[PDB]
Amino acid sequence: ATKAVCVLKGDGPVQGIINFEQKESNGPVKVWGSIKGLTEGLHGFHVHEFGDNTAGCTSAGPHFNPLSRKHGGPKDEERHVGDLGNVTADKDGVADVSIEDSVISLSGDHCIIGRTLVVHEKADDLGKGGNTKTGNAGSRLACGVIGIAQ
């Protein structure tokens, strides 16, 4: 089983560890871990194109989008590969992450190893705001490069 990990860091209190596991190349990727230092509530959660943290999260580029699709939520047909929706933080600022996604991969062209995972200031509206390429999730609070793990 392929495994990966990402340590999210930023300029403030937001920090976390997110694990990834994929049992077969054609199968879903389990994403799990926690992010601390967040405001209680929803926070956008995305894989961005570049594993470039030379300017913090600012250099990560846009949402990872190898298929040139429109932004959406994870269960939407039309979505960026990197659209993992939202995570939810408790009253202590801790967001427990437990996602299973069949669009991201740890191999092939949907490959997220070496790219950047980012958690945002606000909720990602998933393109269902009722009135986007980002989901209006606000600033990039913390991020890290996704690496190969044991």
- Report, as residue numbers or ranges, the catalytic residues: 46, 48, 63, 71, 80, 83, 120, 140
**Window of 1-9, 10-18, 93-101, 113-121 that interacts with Zn ion by CB under 5 A:** 113-121
Q: Which of residues 108-127 bind a second copy (CB under 8 A)?
A: 113-116
Q: Count Cα neighbours of 66 within 13 Å in the Cβ-side half-sphere.
A: 13
Residue 115, interface with Zn ion (CB under 5 A)? Answer: no
110 has binding-site annotation: no
Binds a second copy by CB under 8 A, chosen from 17, 32, 94, 138: 17
- Say which amino acid occupies 13: P
Q: Is 80 in the site for Zn ion (CB under 5 A)?
A: yes
* DSSP assignments along 84-98, one per residue: EEEEEE-TTS-EEEE
Query: Is the alpha carbon torsion for 96, 102, 105, 107 positive or negative?
Result: positive
Q: How far is CA 150 from the centre of its chain?
A: 20
**Footprint of Zn ion on 36-65 (CB under 5 A):** 46, 63
Burial class (CB in 10 A: 0-12, 13-18, 19+), 150: exposed
Indicate which single residue of 10, 72, 74, 144 sits in contact with a second copy (rule: CB under 8 A): 144
Closer residue to Zn ion in complex, CB, 30/69: 69
Residue 1 binds a second copy (CB under 8 A)? yes
Contacts of 60 (CB under 8 A, 6+ apart): 48, 49, 50, 51, 52, 53, 115, 116, 118, 140, 143
94 contributes a contact to a second copy by CB under 8 A = no
If the CB atoms of residues 49 and 83 are measured against a second copy, the closer one turns out to be: 49
**Binding positions for a second copy, rule: CB under 8 A:** 1, 4-5, 7, 17, 49-54, 61, 113-116, 144-150
